Nucleic acid binder design. Structure first.
Lengths: 749, 759
DNA sequence: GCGACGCTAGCGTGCGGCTCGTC
DNA sequence: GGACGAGCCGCCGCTAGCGTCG
């Protein structure tokens, strides 16, 4: 309700609450955080919301004709609370007091539009918009980076995969999608991301669905940033031009996220030193390449750093904790760079010369020494972006500012002398000089010396154990001091703005530097990983031949038994007992293929790999488990080509015996005919004898050693000759009698 | 070593910081809250911990010698802050000022008054309605397991033969804190197993035996008593120790409690307990939970519980009346304990009086036979002693009513007269001086005073003694006032004393009835449960179950699922039979299994059940292997083993697709051997499976049931009706086609099926 | 030949109570 | 000329620093 506040009493709202309600109504989609002193406050129903969400203590804001509930949080703890509130589904509108009893919204906090470094992860934070037309328009925006890109997908499936691959923090759905109760529930069940409203008026040229999705991002984000956004050129892209990595595949392979128990492929490759670099590597992983040319070039760069140890080590040492120049450039362009930002920037530009001396001219790094010297001359060594927005420009930089401060230092020195002269003249070694916004400059005497205070003194305020007096010659000195403090804050602000502007003019140079370094960062990190964990440079061809391949994530935890693999558009069945590494073997094959097509060396002794058009998996655990799996099998059968890598794990399970085998056979045959590279781990000895021309068998076995049965992870040629289902049951502690019947029945069958 | 506070600067440690550091080191695993005035403070790293843990401002305590970090919280909101600290995983050692500052040989006396740990909480605001158990596990002629609920005095334990049974006994109690015997802490392999299965806080306590009986139990009990007496800061209030036998009740393994979502949900969804519980009091919710934790095996007591339930189902007016009255009943059991332990607050006495005023009304409804204690005499003293709405602390406003205690009334009277004096003074001086706006005011810093504004400064009489100068006002003092002020202060100080003395005297009056309070609490808790189960029965349409050796359920339903969706009722007849249920998934086979266990669970708790009619046997335990070693196959085989070793002819066994996870033949073979053993065992077994092969075994007590899917206008429609006989067709391929498998692949699969099946 | 105390401002968690400026 | 922002003083107990007894 507009202008209405929840509480008791008649009378209109007092000034403070009126100002609050007015602001609160200009942003109905957000929780308004109103600054009141050292706190951010919410009133009425909003207080109750903040209180319950954060477990705060509800109080009251009372005036003569109205009393309303109240809850707030300390300014000092803002970021911490904002983060929780954002994660909790809240959208925040921040109203701060405008420097010299007047509040204004300074920030509009939304999960997908965050611009504060402190509330962001190193990785890209995307805002995504979806709209219809000829197919699906999908567009992404990273306000902190300016990254702006999109595409058009023909099927809902492809859309969902493109969406998932980017893990957006917030989604804007077109009106025809928000009204579609069918889509909405399907969408909310699959993507538990915050959904926000936005007008989908078209923008720019191209497919209408894209023009619209793009219109929504811009309109919504501009609102969040209170005006013009700082975006890089919108980039249209074709998912079809890269290796396909559906959601199911990304999850099963734990590329970016763990299924259960930490450690992902990305964490193992987590060796970059800079945020732009981590971002770039994530970008490459997200969309692996299909073209040999660019891949071979990337591999050369990595090989370069592997051979040039001193250089590699030199670069990595220098990039350590280097500031995110790309996001800094964005904060500058938007007129939001803080004094701290400029401090971080000058520090970064002091490292730049070192990187270039090491890297050389061909690298193309910009020379920003002029900017560096300016920041070195202008800023205090530790810019107090927060300490007051003052005490920022160092002495010596600006003459007008220096003169004012010097005038001020004398005023302060004056009162220091006034104090000494007075405690010598009065004999009160305790006599003090202090200032207060209310009484200004005064003299202070403790209770024990009240009878030594001269009569010239005019008492002005009495406290518990002391009293403050005044002296005729003190007034003019006070107001002059206050006059100077105002002039100083004002001048120092002007200088900061001028300094900040000079840094702003170099924004493109900053982005260019950030980009070149991000690449260097990635190549050097892939090289370090390769050298550190023993990775080799892959070679591309039609046949897949891997010697001593290992699962890159798993081997970092235990001693890994490497395995070989040779495939060429074949249906490879892997029989044998579970707990023998069959699953990890399928996954490691996929990870080596993914790494190679990203331009990284791989965990093997030798690896000849084809350039897959995609990796499709059916691995791991209202709709039953069987139907979920059949749905995944359906997508594989519909998307896999002769150039796809397909990984199936126990496909066919979860139903009756016969239907189960009939299904896996039909699926196996379809894949055998598709000419895809298929690794099918199964228990169906029956599939092992289909006799199709490109059908190949492999298996793992177990041996009842000292323990009673030890599963060997060595992948062996030919099909499994034995079944250990019963033996495992016997090992599980199932009654000997029951184990015996099973064997009897097993053989009897 | 330890005895040094973190902080920069050389020199010694200030006296206070010494008194602080001394106590701190005494409780290495607790966060010490050191009372200093109206704040509980922490120094050094501990101040750092506290500050970040609660997001407090981090200051410092400077002294010539050196300065150290400092963080603190006002005593006002102690419990609120502790609540937070507790939930973060901290243990708290509370050090208060034991000696009034008004008389201390320098440094105020400070000692640890109590420890706050998850399993020994006594504060109402830090406790859940449910029982809060401290548990202790030890060895010594079996596995000793003992529990203590310090807030109620519940004190019980038992000995178990295996580790499996120990763990299950522990789980059904969901302890908040566990004390492990030294040997178990020493046993590295045990500890890890324990930590993984039980994420609960582990604490240290000595395990010197206490009392008589099995060593293991005497040790666990000793641990509970040594630990709780320490935390409580004194002698505990305990109910007679109960050495019970879990074998005397229905067995409910952890796997079962979890699979049936009795107390905890699997997917955020409701719980049997959340649905069943409409209890009005905490003692009642606890009693109901206790009954669910250990369902009975005895027909007689069960029929008695059902009689009381049925009685409240019929007598609607009485049922709603009792529930209306109970709604306002405080927790008299926990109130009794606080009374006995000398912790009862003026707030507790208010709640006590309110409850005792309800007592006679309930007695009037249930009649003079429930055995409810007559406590009107205590009620009257409370009514005559405390103001209508009692304050939180005796130190402030009037806790005690006027006319109750003469000493106090004499004191208050003189205070009223002392205050009137100043009001009269303001009027006397306004006329004497002629300054109309003159005022007599007061503030804690200057005391009472005369106030005149700037326009009358040259009008102030010579007698006025300047006291406080303000911007445009000046305050003075007259000799007569100084005297009177000191008087008002003396009265105020005497009033706080006498009033606290009266509170304590009244509290002691209540404490003497602690036992009657517990007794009234037990009776009402039981009635709360019976009326509550009747309430649920009437609201959801449940019926009274009959006990026999045959299980005969007509139109039964899952009591929880039906709560959020239209449920299709189903029948079931079973008599020590192996019941196989074939058919596709998504047709309610699992729900059918679970509803069976829940109906049986509810009946053995003395509750009506969700069905049209239910004839039920008395099961000795419910064993499940539903949903959910390293391999999936191996894990399920382990569960099956436990089931085969504990299952009896009186057990209800629920198997969900046992045999999955391996090869064709091995799967069917294992499923068969398991089926035959359970058939031989004669337990009541419901076995949901896809194996048509199991439907034709040569077993005399094997019965077939199934669910079916229907290929209609939509594609495939699953029917939740449980049908007689085995499935006549498989729907795997159809479901696959429904999942989107391409037509030709589905077609090829059908062709393969018809060729295979065609031998 | 300086240890023992007397007296008393200063000081700071979170934040009540009190002041002051404005209208 | 009452009512409403807005911001400071002190709390309660301990201490350093003096100002002295003997």
């Amino acid at each position: 309700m507009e202008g209405m506040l929840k509480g008791e009493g008649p009378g209109p709202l007092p000034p403070l609450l009126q100002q609050y309600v007015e602001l609160r109504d200009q942003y109905p989609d957000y929780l308004l955080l109103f600054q009141v002193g050292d706190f951010y406050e919410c009133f009425g129903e909003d207080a109750e919301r903040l209180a319950r969400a954060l477990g705060l203590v509800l109080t009251h804001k009372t005036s003569k004709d109205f009393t309303t509930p109240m809850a707030g949080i300390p300014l000092r703890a803002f970021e911490a609370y904002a983060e929780r509130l954002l994660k909790m589904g809240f959208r925040l509108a921040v109203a701060d007091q405008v420097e010299p009893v007047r509040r204004e919204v300074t920030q509009l906090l939304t999960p997908g539009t965050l611009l504060q470094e402190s509330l962001l992860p190193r990785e890209a934070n995307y805002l995504a918009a979806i709209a219809t037309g000829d197919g699906w328009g999908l567009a992404f925006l990273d306000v902190s980076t300016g990254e702006f890109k999109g595409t058009v997908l023909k099927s809902k499936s492809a859309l969902y995969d493109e969406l998932f691959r980017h893990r957006p923090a917030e989604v804007l759905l077109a009106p025809e999608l928000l009204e579609n109760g069918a889509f909405l529930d399907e969408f909310r069940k699959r993507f538990p991301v915050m959904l926000s409203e936005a007008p989908f008026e078209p923008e720019g040229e191209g497919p209408l669905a894209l023009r619209r999705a793009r219109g929504a991002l811009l309109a919504y984000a501009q609102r969040t940033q209170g005006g013009a956004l700082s975006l890089q050129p919108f980039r249209f892209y074709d998912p079809g031009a890269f290796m396909r990595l559906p959601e199911a595949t990304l999850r099963a392979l734990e590329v970016f996220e763990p299924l259960r128990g930490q450690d992902t492929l990305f964490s193992v490759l987590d060796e970059t030193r800079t945020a732009p670099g981590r971002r770039l590597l994530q970008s490459w992983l997200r969309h692996p390449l299909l073209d040999r040319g660019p891949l071979e070039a990337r591999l050369d760069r990595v090989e370069g750093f592997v051979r040039e140890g001193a250089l590699r080590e030199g670069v990595r040492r220098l990039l350590y904790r280097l500031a995110d120049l790309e996001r800094l450039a964005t904060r500058l362009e938007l007129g939001r760079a803080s004094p701290k930002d400029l401090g971080a920037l000058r520090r970064s530009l002091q490292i730049l010369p070192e990187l270039r001396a090491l890297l050389g001219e061909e690298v193309g790094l910009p020379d920003l020494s002029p900017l560096k010297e300016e920041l070195e001359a202008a800023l205090v060594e530790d810019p107090p972006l927060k300490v007051s927005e003052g005490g920022l420009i160092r002495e010596g930089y600006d003459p007008d500012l220096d003169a004012l401060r010097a005038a001020h230092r004398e005023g302060v020195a004056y009162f220091l002398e006034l104090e000494e002269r007075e405690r010598e003249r009065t004999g009160i070694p305790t006599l003090k000089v202090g200032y207060n916004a209310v009484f200004g400059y005064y003299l202070e005497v403790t209770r024990p010396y009240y009878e030594r205070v001269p009569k010239e003194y005019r008492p002005v305020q009495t406290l518990k154990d002391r009293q403050r007096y005044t002296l005729p010659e003190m007034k003019e000195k006070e107001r002059e001091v206050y006059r100077l403090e105002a002039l100083i804050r004002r001048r120092e602000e002007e200088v900061f703005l001028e300094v900040r502007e000079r840094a702003k003019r170099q924004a493109e140079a900053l982005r260019e530097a950030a980009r070149i370094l991000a690449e260097l960062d990635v190549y050097a990190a892939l090289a370090e990983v390769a050298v550190r964990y023993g990775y080799v440079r892959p070679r591309f061809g039609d046949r897949l031949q891997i010697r001593a391949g290992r699962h890159p994530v798993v081997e970092r935890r235990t001693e890994f038994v490497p395995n070989d693999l040779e495939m060429a558009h074949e249906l490879v069945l892997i029989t044998g007992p579970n707990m023998a590494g069959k699953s990890t073997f399928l996954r490691q094959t996929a990870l080596i293929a993914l790494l190679a097509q990203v331009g990284s060396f791989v965990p093997a002794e030798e690896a000849h790999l084809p350039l897959f058009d995609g990796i499709y998996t059916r691995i791991g655990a209202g709709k039953s488990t069987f139907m979920v799996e059949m749905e995944e099998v359906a997508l594989i059968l519909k998307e896999a080509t002769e150039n796809s890598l397909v990984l199936l794990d126990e496909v066919g399970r979860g139903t009756s015996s016969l239907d189960g085998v009939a299904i896996a056979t039909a699926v196996a045959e379809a894949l055998h005919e598709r000419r895809a590279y298929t690794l099918f781990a199964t228990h169906y000895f029956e599939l092992t004898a289909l006799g199709l021309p490109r059908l190949k068998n492999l298996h793992v076995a177990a041996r009842e050693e000292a323990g009673g049965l030890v599963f060997y992870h060595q992948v062996l040629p030919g099909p499994a000759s034995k079944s250990y289902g019963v033996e495992v049951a016997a090992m599980a502690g199932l009654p000997k009698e029951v184990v015996a019947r099973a064997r009897a029945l097993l053989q009897a069958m």
